[PDB]
Amino acid sequence: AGKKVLIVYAHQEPKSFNGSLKNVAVDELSRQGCTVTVSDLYAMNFEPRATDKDITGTLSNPEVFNYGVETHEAYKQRSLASDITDEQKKVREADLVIFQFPLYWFSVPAILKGWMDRVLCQGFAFDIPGFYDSGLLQGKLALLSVTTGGTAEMYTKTGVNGDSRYFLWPLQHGTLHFCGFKVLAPQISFAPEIASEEERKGMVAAWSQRLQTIWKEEPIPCTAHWHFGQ
């Protein structure tokens, strides 16, 4: 129908390749009749740092500050900072969450890493127990849409950077799977800066076109073998 999508978007420049990919997601999902929300982290000046400012209530231990303990508890008490609960609400209502970002050091840009650290808290995204396939975000989909400086070939088994999937592990498995998401196959747009005009437009249309049938997709097996082989 009928689906609710959250795009968590991490690029500074709306005219970027990232902004284009974000905009065609919105266009295409919107045209399908889906409900769409965008967390534009840079435009929000989203706070990436995990600090005692994230808890507004009496601390469980005010002598020695433990971020994980205090946020678990603030979540249960509903004394978390409001910028964190606003995201949680977006995540809670979403059926699909797409992360749109350029790769920074084989990972997400810090502003997005901060959204992950501060938003996916214990009690909300997972618990002990209640992680991986019993993770709290079960029944939800997640998809990483990454753009790189390096080419497709750099990111091969035997290229300098190794296989692209190697860098996907901490994000797909250690974070998304861990919270219960089914993970859809990543969308990697390699080296747009080097690509020609045509190859770039093909890359944008390929994203557009994949989204046409996104609801029909099966998740990847989010395992050590998918990521590493052998």
Ligand X SMILES: CC(=O)Nc1ccc2c(c1)[C@@H](CC#N)C(=O)N2C
Residue 63 binds to ligand FAD (criterion: CB under 6 A): no
Site string for ligand X, 90-129 (x = CB under 6 A): ---------------x----------------x-------
- Residue from 192, 207, 211, 214 binding ligand FAD (CB under 6 A): 192
Residues near 151 by beta carbon (within 8 Å), at least 6 away in sequence: 190, 191, 194
Token duo for residue 67: 């971020």
Does position 187 bind ligand FAD by CB under 6 A? no
Rounded distance between C-alpha atoms, residue 141 and residue 134, angstroms: 14
From the list ligand FAD, Zn ion, a second copy, none, pick the one residue 18 interacts with, judged by a Cβ distance below 5 to 8 Å according to partner type.
ligand FAD
Min dist. Cβ of residue 4 to ligand FAD (A): 25
Near Zn ion by CB under 5 A: residue from 11, 72, 177, 182: 177
Among 37, 60, 161, 208, binds a second copy (CB under 8 A): 161
Q: How far is CA 1 from CA 5, 104, 181, 211, in A?
A: 12, 35, 20, 14
Amino acid at 105: W
Q: Which of 22, 6, 181, 177 is nearest to 89 (CA)?
A: 6
Q: What is the secondary structure of 162-173 as a DSSP string?
A: --HHHHHHIIII
Q: Total residues contacting ligand X (rule CB under 6 A)?
A: 8
Residue 225 contact among ligand FAD, ligand X, a second copy, none, beta carbon within 5 to 8 Å by kind: none
Q: Which stretch binds a second copy (CB under 8 A): 26-34, 111-119, 180-188, 208-216?
A: 111-119
β-strands 141-147, 187-189 pairing = parallel
Q: How far apart are CA 202 and CA 21, in angstroms?
A: 12
Q: Residue 181 interacts with ligand X (CB under 6 A)?
A: no
Q: Residue numbers of the site for Zn ion (CB under 5 A)?
A: 173, 177, 222
